[PDB]
Every structure is written in C-alpha cells, then in structure tokens.
Amino acid sequence: SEFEAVIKVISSACKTYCGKTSPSKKEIGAMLSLLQKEGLLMSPSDLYSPGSWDPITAALSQRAMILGKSGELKTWGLVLGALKAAREEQVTSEQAKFWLGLGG
User: Fold this and answer.
1) What are the percentages of helix, strand and coil residues in the chain, rounded to 5?
2) What sign results for the dihedral spanned by CA atoms 72, 74, 75, 81?
3) Contact predicate 13/99, CB 8 Å
4) H or E stretch covering 102
5) Residues 6+ apart with CB under 8 A from 35
6) Where in the cell is it found?
7) Which domain holds residue 31?
C-alpha cells in the first residue's frame, strides 16, 4: 500500500522542516486514515498536491467544531507547515531528480 510509505515520507519531512514539535507516526496515520474515510483523499499521495490543502484545512476545521475532535487538525497544521517550508526552501524537480538518481 501507498499508505505506510506516505507516513514514512511525511515523517521524514517533519523531522527536517518540522521545527520544534513534531508528530508521531500513529498521529499521521490517524489523520490520513480519517481523510480516506471522509472521502477527501482517494489515494494518500494526493495529499502532497497543493490542490488539496485548502479543502483539508476546511474539513478538519469543521470536524473540530461540529464533533469537538481536533487531534487530527493539530497534526495537519504541523504537517502542512512542513510541506510549505519544503516547497519554498527547495526546487521541486531538482530534489526529485536527486532521489531517482540514487535509485539505480
């Protein structure tokens, strides 16, 4: 499954761009698993695409208000910070070229 690999990747990004606090792999999975259940993420890689970021935020916000469940929103806040960091701080395609180069 794409799923447990995406947890790895995200967990990597947070250790690097996640200043201070960082979330647990349990917490990241919880976020992801919910997002799949709620029908937002069709595949867990779709979360890297920025198209999805505003929608997610909105939806996890609703959840904190309506159902009083904010744990996953907190995760997403940390996580998104890392994604944006990473997008600004690097050239996207060059960083990918590097990874596939190592692949052999």
Assistant:
1) 75, 0, 25
2) positive
3) no
4) helix 92-102
5) 41, 47, 56
6) Virion
7) 1-104
